[PDB]
Amino acid sequence: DGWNKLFDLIQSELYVRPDDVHVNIRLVEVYRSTKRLKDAVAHCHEAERNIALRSSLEWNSCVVQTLKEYLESLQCLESDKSDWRATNTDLLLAYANLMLLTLSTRDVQESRELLQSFDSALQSVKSLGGNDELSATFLEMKGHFYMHAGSLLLKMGQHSSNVQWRALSELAALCYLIAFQVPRPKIKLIKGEAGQNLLEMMACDRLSQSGHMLLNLSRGKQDFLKEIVETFANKSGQSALYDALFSSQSPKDTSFLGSDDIGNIDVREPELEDLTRYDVGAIRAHNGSLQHLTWLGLQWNSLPALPGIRKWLKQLFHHLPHETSRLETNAPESICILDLEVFLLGVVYTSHLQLKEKCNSHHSSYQPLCLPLPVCKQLCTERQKSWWDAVCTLIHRKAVPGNVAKLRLLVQHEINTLRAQEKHGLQPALLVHWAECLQKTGSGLNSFYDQREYIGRSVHYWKKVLPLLKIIKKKNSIPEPIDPLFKHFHSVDIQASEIVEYEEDAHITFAILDAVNGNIEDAVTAFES
Numbered sequence: 001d002g003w004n005k006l007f008d009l010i011q012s013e014l015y016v017r018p019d020d021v022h023v024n025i026r027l028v029e030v031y032r033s034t035k036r037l038k039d040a041v042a043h044c045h046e047a048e049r050n051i052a053l054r055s056s057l058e059w060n061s062c063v064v065q066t067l068k069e070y071l072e073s074l075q076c077l078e079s080d081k082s083d084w085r086a087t088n089t090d091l092l093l094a095y096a097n098l099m100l101l102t103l104s105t106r107d108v109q110e111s112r113e114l115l116q117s118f119d120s121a122l123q124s125v126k127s128l129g130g131n132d133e134l135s136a137t138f139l140e141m142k143g144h145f146y147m148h149a150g151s152l153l154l155k156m157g158q159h160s161s162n163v164q165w166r167a168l169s170e171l172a173a174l175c176y177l178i179a180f181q182v183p184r185p186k187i188k189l190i191k192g193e194a195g196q197n198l199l200e201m202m203a204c205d206r207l208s209q210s211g212h213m214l215l216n217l218s219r220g221k222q223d224f225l226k227e228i229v230e231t232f233a234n235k236s237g238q239s240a241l242y243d244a245l246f247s248s249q250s251p252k253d254t255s256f257l258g259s260d261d262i263g264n265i266d267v268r269e270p271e272l273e274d275l276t277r278y279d280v281g282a283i284r285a286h287n288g289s290l291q292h293l294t295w296l297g298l299q300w301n302s303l304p305a306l307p308g309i310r311k312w313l314k315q316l317f318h319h320l321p322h323e324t325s326r327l328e329t330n331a332p333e334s335i336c337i338l339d340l341e342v343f344l345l346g347v348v349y350t351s352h353l354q355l356k357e358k359c360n361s362h363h364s365s366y367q368p369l370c371l372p373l374p375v376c377k378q379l380c381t382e383r384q385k386s387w388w389d390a391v392c393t394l395i396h397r398k399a400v401p402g403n404v405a406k407l408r409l410l411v412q413h414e415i416n417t418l419r420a421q422e423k424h425g426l427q428p429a430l431l432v433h434w435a436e437c438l439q440k441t442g443s444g445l446n447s448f449y450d451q452r453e454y455i456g457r458s459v460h461y462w463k464k465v466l467p468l469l470k471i472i473k474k475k476n477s478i479p480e481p482i483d484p485l486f487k488h489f490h491s492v493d494i495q496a497s498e499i500v501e502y503e504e505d506a507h508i509t510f511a512i513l514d515a516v517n518g519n520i521e522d523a524v525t526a527f528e529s
Contacts, residue, residue: 003034018047021056028062032069038079041070045090049194051287057105060098067091085134086191088125092137095121096144096202103148103374108156115152116246116255118145123256136189140199142260143182143206149245149257150175150213151372158366158375165366171241173217174232176210177225181266204281209373211270211278212299216370218269219302229267238262272305280311286373288316290347290388294379297348298355302369307348309341310441310454317395323453327460330415332408335391338457339418341441342434343387346418346486349433351379353489383485387414417485420464425484428468429492432502435461439509448520452513459513462506473499 010027017023024047031040044063053059067090070076076084095118102111122145125138150172157168184203190196218224232240242248242258252258279296286292293312300307313320314337324334355368368376378385390410393399399407417424420431435458442454471478472494480488494502 003030006030007034019050019052021053021059024053025058025062028066032066037066037070037073038075040066041087041090048090054097055101055287055289057098057101060094060101063094064091064098067094085128085130085132088128089134089137092121092125092141093198093202096141096148099144099148100374103151103155108152111152111155112246115145115149116250118148119246119256120254123254123259126256126259131189133190133195136185137199139182140185140203140206143179143210144202145179145256146175146182147179147206147210148374149241150179150210151374152245154370154372155375158371162365168244169217170228171232171237171244173214173224173228174237174241176213176217177228177265177267178262179206179210180214180270181268182206201281201285204278205285207270208275208278208282208296211275212296213370213372214270215303216299216367225267225269229265233262233265272303276305276308280308280315283312283315288392290380290385291378292373293344294347294351295373295376297344298352298369298379301348301352306437306441309344310337313337313340313344320395322450323456327419328421330412330419330421332391332394332411332415335395335411335415338438338453339415340391342438342457343384343414343418345434345437346430347380347384349430350381350486350489353491354487355379356491357489381487386410387485414485420461423481424464425481425486425488426464427484427486427488427492428465428472428478428494429489430486431461431465431468432494434458435465435506435509439512443512448516448523451516452520455509455513455516458509462509466503466506469494469499469502472496 007027007030010023010030013023014020014027024043028040028043031037031043044066047053047059048063067087070087071084071091076087095114099111099114099118102114122138122142125134129135153168153172153175157165157172160168185199187196187200190199214225231237238258238260242252242255245257246255283293293309296312297307297309317337317340320340321336323338324336326334359368380388387410390407393403394407394411416422417426420426438454438461439458442451442456442458445451445454468478473496475496
């Protein structure tokens with residue numbers, strides 16, 4: 001009697017607000033308690049479409065539990081074995097997501113018990129085998145397992161001695177390495193067109209996250225990957241890994257980590273040309289959260305290349321224009337990809353200097369760049385995050401009359417600082433970094449129009465720097481802003497000797513701009529004739 005009256009209220013509320021985390025979870029509980037367990041999984045399968053739920057730990061925890069219950073039911077074990085395999089795929093995937101969220105927002109214990117439960121899930125499915133969505137899904141999920149295993153190891157050593165950090169970090173390299181060895185999933189074996197994009201997406205995030213970690217650990221040491229595979233790829237490593245990750249007293253025969261064979265590890269270091277393609281493919285794996293982007297950007301500060309922020313944004317926001325003619329205004333409707341790329345460069349620029357300041361007081365007991373994505377803390381200020389989350393909900397046009405007021409003003413507040421307008425909190429060094437990256441990134445483009453856009457901003461920012469350089473040239477102090485969007489650091493204070501060199505670069509870029517326009521004029525008149 002009561003369950004039915006409550007079912008109507010939940011369902012009628014989902015009519016208008018179908019993305020609420022708690023309201024959806026209460027519906028899953030109703031279907032579970034009312035013996036309609038099949039309809040429960042049917043909802044989670046259909047609610048996973050919404051990404052706001054995929055990012056919630058409470059949701060994935062509910063999807064795992066309800067999926068595990070449905071496997072033990074007769075309505076599943078009998079009705080269809082293909083549906084049984086389909087439900088197993090969803091379970092392995094939910095575990096992976098849940099394992100990711102747990103590592104970032106929980107302690108070492110709860111994450112361990114989950115990985116151990118994850119291990120039991122893999123063990124149970126490896127006997128089936130096959131060659132379909134479940135077989136292809138199982139292989140990719142094995143990589144996430146080892147990947148998250150490495151993330152767990154580095155997390156444990158974060159609060160241990162340095163000698164312990166060596167033993168754990170070495171074992172972590174093994175896990176990440178094994179995860180990178182896993183081949184790309186065969187997209188041909190998947191059923192749904194969305195599933196093909198998903199598994200491909202997850203594969204990229206596995207390679208990008210693991211790959212950058214392999215390099216982050218083997219940068220300081222020579223042939224680091226070789227020593228690891230020689231000593232730890234042996235059966236001794238499996239016993240050292242299992243005993244390290246899980247409670248050694250648990251049965252090792254019934255565990256996947258102990259039974260799995262680690263044969264023919266390529267001991268190959270990831271290539272940068274491949275990582276860039278992985279990062280771009282993994283941009284959507286975390287819904288483009290500013291924590292994910294700022295992390296990828298920080299990786300390339302130690303690597304010999306620039307982060308493909310242009311391709312990242314062009315991949316995230318397709319319809320968003322490159323540049324707006326209203327560079328004078330700060331209206332949030334005129335937001336463009338450059339406004340975002342220039343913003344992301346600032347967050348990465350400030351984030352790297354803040355980590356360095358904490359590291360100097362902490363004496364690099366743990367290198368700032370060497371922590372994995374889930375473990376490390378929030379890498380951006382809450383103000384910078386508020387802007388990104390606000391602009392994203394506006395570009396995607398997922399706003400509400402009760403939000404438009406807040407989302408607009410939160411964006412408009414910073415457009416001045418991004419476009420170097422009146423009272424921008426930009427430090428002279430930061431503006432240069434923008435002009436340098438925008439000039440460099442723009443020249444490498446093939447479309448003469450796209451070159452003009454990026455190189456155009458570089459000229460714009462350069463013009464906004466020169467007045468500040470003359471002031472530093474004359475040994476006159478620039479006014480330090482009040483509560484700037486991007487923190488000022490004295491470690492990058494421009495000095496007299498550097499003023500003349502920048503004035504050159506500025507005049508050069510101006511000429512590069514005129515050269516591009518010149519080639520566009522040649523193309524224009526040729527199209528007229």
